[PDB]
Amino acid sequence: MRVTQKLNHGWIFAEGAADPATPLAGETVTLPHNAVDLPLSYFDETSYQRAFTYQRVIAWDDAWQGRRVQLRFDGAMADNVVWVNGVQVVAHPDGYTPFVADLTDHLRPGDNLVTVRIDGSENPAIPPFGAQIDYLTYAGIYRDVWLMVLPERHLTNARILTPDALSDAKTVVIRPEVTAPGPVRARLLDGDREIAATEGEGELTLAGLTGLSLWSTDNPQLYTVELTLPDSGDVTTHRFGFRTAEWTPQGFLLNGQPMKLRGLNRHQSWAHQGYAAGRHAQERDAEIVRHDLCCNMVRTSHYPQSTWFLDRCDEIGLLVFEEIPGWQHIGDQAWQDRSVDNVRAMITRDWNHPSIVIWGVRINESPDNHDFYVRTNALARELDPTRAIGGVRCITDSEMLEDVYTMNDFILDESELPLINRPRTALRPTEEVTGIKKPVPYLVTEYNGHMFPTKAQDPELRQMEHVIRHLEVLNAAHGDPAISGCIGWCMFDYNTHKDFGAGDRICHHGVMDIWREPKFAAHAYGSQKPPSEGIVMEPVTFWARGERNIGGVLPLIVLTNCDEVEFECAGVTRRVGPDRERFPHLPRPPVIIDHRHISAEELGQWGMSWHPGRITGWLNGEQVALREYVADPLPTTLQIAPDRDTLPADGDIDLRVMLRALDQVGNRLPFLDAGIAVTVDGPARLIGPDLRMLQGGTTGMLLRLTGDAGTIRITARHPQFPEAVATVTVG
C-alpha cells in the first residue's frame, strides 16, 4: 500500500536565505511554525516580510526502492521553493494552497538534505498582494507536512458525487484520478459496516441505496469511500455526505426544506502566532461557531482555510462559504492568471466537503472585471457543476456572471453622516442593490464591522448599541424573504495592517475578542438557538450604578431563549416577554425591560444606594435560569479555564486557556486594568507574554504542546486575588 505520514517534528529554522545543499544551522522547531512572533498590538508587521529557510534530514530506507517519495505540504506563506541535496524540486507561490515535491530521483543512500525557501513579503506577482489589505499574512510553514511513499502506478484524487440525493434509493458516483490505467476498485462504508462495492477503470458507480441517512445542519451523517488499485495495492479514502443545497431566488433550501442563514465571517489568525495553529485549535473555531454563536453558516475571510477546519464543519453540520484569496485588489493579466490557478487549487481540493455550499470566485470587493471574472466563473462551472457560484461586492449595480448576488451591506449607519436624508435603514431592498427588478438569488456576506467598532472594555452604553445593531440586521434578513440569509462582520478581533483599525494593529470588529472569549454581542447570535439546544440568558450590563449616562440599568437588554425573564431587586419585581413590537422577525427575540414595564418611581426616585439583583428565565413557567448581581463586587476567584483537562501526547496541539477575574457571586469584573502573571510547567510552552493583560476582566493564551507525556501545571497570580492553579494531564 501507501504510507501517508506526518513529519512535523525536527525541522531547522533559520532567518535568511541559505545555500540549499550545506547542512543549514539555525533554531530547532516542530510544525506548524510562524517565523516572526508578534506583540498583541502596536508592531512593525513588515518584520516578517523577509527571507527564512527551513530544513529537514531524511535517511534512505532499504524499504523504498522504486517507490515514489513525496512531500505534501499542506501550506506555507509565501513564494516557496524546495530543494533535495541541492536540486530544486518545486516552486509554489501561493500561501494558501498545498503543493507536492517529488524526492525519488534525487534521494541517495544515507541522509538527504531537503531545503525550503520562504519569502514572507508582499510580492505583487503573488495574490493577494500589490496594495492594501485589512488583514495580516504572517509567514512560515503554518500548516502540516506529510511523508507519503507511494507505488509507481497510483492514485491522486477522486471526486465523489451525488445524483438524486433525495431518492430513497440513493446514488453514488466516483471519478478517481491516477498515474496509469488499470482497474480501480471501491467500497462505500458506514463506520466499519460495508454498504456496497463496484470495480473498473473510469467512473465507478453505486446505486439503489436503501438504508442511508442524509447529511444536514441537524444530522451531519457522513459516509466514506475506500479506493484501491488492485495492481499495486494503493489505497485511499474520502468522506462526503448526501445533501441538496439550492439557491433559488425565493430563498435557500437545504435538502428540500428552506433555511435563513445566520452566520459570521472567520479569519484563521491568532494573537502573536498568526496562522501557525494546528488541527485542534482550528477544530475549536468551527465548534464555537456552530454551537456558541449558533450559526448555520461560516464564510472563510478572505482565503481558503485549513482542511482540519473544513473536516470539522462536515462533522458538526455547519455550512461554509469558501473564497479564493484576495482583498479588493486586482493586478495585471499575469496576476489574473495566478488568481485563476487558485480557483483550481481551491475547488479541486475541497469538492467533497458537504459543508461547502457556495464558492467565492470574485476577489473581495474588487471592481467588476468582465474578462477575468468571466474566466473564473467559467472555470469552476466546469470543475464543479454541483455547488453554486458566488462572489463578494460592496457596490450596487454589478455584473452578475455569478449564480448568487453576494453583497456587503454597510448601510448601518449613515444617518450619522452630515449630508444624509436616508433615515437610518439596516439593510437595502434587494433591487436597489442588484440593479434588476428580476428576482435573483441573494445573500448578505458582511455588515456592521468598521461601521461600529466595539472594544472588549467599551462603555456599558456602547456595547448596547453594538449588540442592537447586530439584532437590527439579523431582524432585517429574517423578515425579507428576498434575502436568503446574512453573515456579520466579524467572528473575532484580528490583527491588521497599519492602514486600518484603531491604529493599534487591531480591527475591533468581533463579537468575541481575539481569544474567542465573547463580548456581549456573542449572545445575539448564540441566543437564536432553541432551548432544546441549550438555555441562554445574558443581561447586558455590569450592574454598575453610574457606569452609564445618568445611571441605573434601564433600559435593560436580556438576550435569551426564554418566554420570559424576571427583574428582581430593591423590593421591585417584573415578568417581561421578548420585544416583538421591536424585533418581530428574530427566532428568539431578546427581552427588553423599560419604562413600559417599570418607572424610576417604583425603584424610588433615585433613593440613593445600590442594591444587588437577581434575574431569572422561564420556560412554560419552569424556573430555568438565574443570574445574580452583587451591588459591591470584590475580587474573589481568579479563574483558570482550559478547554480540556485531558489531552494526548500530541505535538500539533495548541491548547486555548482562558483567565477571568471574578467577583463574589461569579460575574466577571469588567474594569480591572491589570496584568496576570503566570507560570506553565511540564510538556507545554506558553505562547506570548509571561505577563497577560486583562480586557473586560478576561484574557486567554495558547500553549503549544511538546508532544511528550506529563502533567502540565499552570499558576496565575495578582496581589488582589487568592493564588490560582490548574493542570491537565498529557497522556
Ligand X SMILES: OC[C@H]1O[C@H](O)[C@H](O)[C@@H](O)[C@@H]1O
Binding site members: 134, 327, 364-365, 446, 450
Binding residues for beta-D-galactose: 134, 327, 364-365, 446, 450
- Quick one: which of 608, 620, 622, 646 contacts a second copy (CB under 8 A)? 608
* Count of helix runs (H) and strand runs (E) in the chain: 8, 43
134 binds ligand GAL, rule: CB under 6 A: yes
Cα 676 to Cα 635: distance, rounded to the nearest angstrom: 13
Residue 338 or 450: the one with the smaller Cβ distance to ligand GAL is: 450
569 touches ligand X by CB under 6 A: yes
**CB under 5 to 8 A by kind: which of ligand GAL, Cl ion, a second copy, none does 275 bind?**
none
Q: By CB under 8 A, tell whether 646 contacts a second copy.
A: no
Location of C-alpha cell 506558553: 686
Near a second copy by CB under 8 A: residue from 155, 313, 388, 506:
506
Between CA 70 and CA 83 the distance in angstroms is 12
Block residue for cell numbers 457543476: 385
Taking CB under 5 A as the criterion, the residue among 14, 57, 189, 196 binding Cl ion is 196
Question: What are the grid coordinates assigned to 78, written together?
Answer: 509565501
What distance in Å separates the CA atoms of residue 351 and residue 323, rounded to the nearest whole number?
Answer: 13
Contact of 412 with 469, CB cutoff 8 Å: yes
Q: Are strands 185-190 and 223-229 parallel, antiparallel or unpaired?
A: antiparallel
Interatomic CA distance for residues 302 and 268, integer angstroms? 9
Q: Is the dihedral of CA 307, 312, 315, 321 positive or negative?
A: negative
Per-residue cell: 354: 458537504
Q: Any contact of residue 631 with a second copy (CB under 8 A)?
A: yes
Q: Which residue has the cell 428565565?
A: 617
User: Based on the number of CB atoms within 10 Å of its own CB, is 57 exposed (0-12), middle (13-18) or buried (19 or more)?
Assistant: middle
**Residue 674, interface with Cl ion (CB under 5 A)?**
no
Catalogue the active-site residues: 365, 446
Instruction: Tell me which of a second copy, ligand X, ligand GAL, none is bound by residue 63, counting a contact when its beta carbon lies within the kind-specific cut-off of 5 to 8 angstroms.
Output: none
HSE-up of residue 262 (Cα within 13 Å, Cβ side):
29
Interaction of residue 189 with Cl ion, rule CB under 5 A: no
Per CB under 6 A, the list member of 34, 228, 306, 408 interacting with ligand GAL is 408
Residue 413 binds a second copy, judged by CB under 8 A: yes
CA 557 to chain centre: 28
Residue nearest to Cl ion (CB): 196
Q: What is the dihedral of CA 483, 487, 489, 494, to 10 degrees?
A: -160
Q: Which of 17, 334, 436, 502 binds a second copy (CB under 8 A)?
A: 502
Q: Which residue lies nearer to ligand X by CB, 431 or 568?
A: 568
Per-residue x/- marks for ligand X, 600-629, CB under 6 A?
------------xxx-------------x-
Residue 551 interacts with a second copy (CB under 8 A): yes or no = yes
Can residue 291 be called a binding residue for ligand X (CB under 6 A)? no
Report the C-alpha gap between 535 and 626 in whole angstroms: 11
Q: What is the DSSP letter of 41?
A: S
CB of 167 to Cl ion, least distance (A): 15
Q: Which part of the chain contacts a second copy (CB under 8 A), choosing from 25-33, 166-174, 450-458, 532-540?
A: 450-458
Q: Which amino acid is at 700?
A: G
693 interface partner picked from ligand GAL, a second copy, Cl ion, none, CB below 5 to 8 A per type? a second copy
Nearer to a second copy, 371 or 673 (CB): 673
What separation in angstroms does the CA of 184 have from each of 149, 152, 200?
19, 14, 5
Query: What does 613 interact with, of ligand GAL, a second copy, ligand X, none (CB < 5 to 8 A by kind)?
Result: ligand X
Residue with cell 473544513: 310
Contacts of ligand X in 449-508 (CB under 6 A): none
In whole angstroms, the minimum distance from the beta carbon of 246 to a second copy comes to 36
By CB under 6 A, name the binding residues for ligand X: 568-569, 612-614, 628
By CB under 6 A, name the binding residues for ligand GAL: 134-135, 301-302, 364-365, 394, 408, 446, 449-450, 489, 509
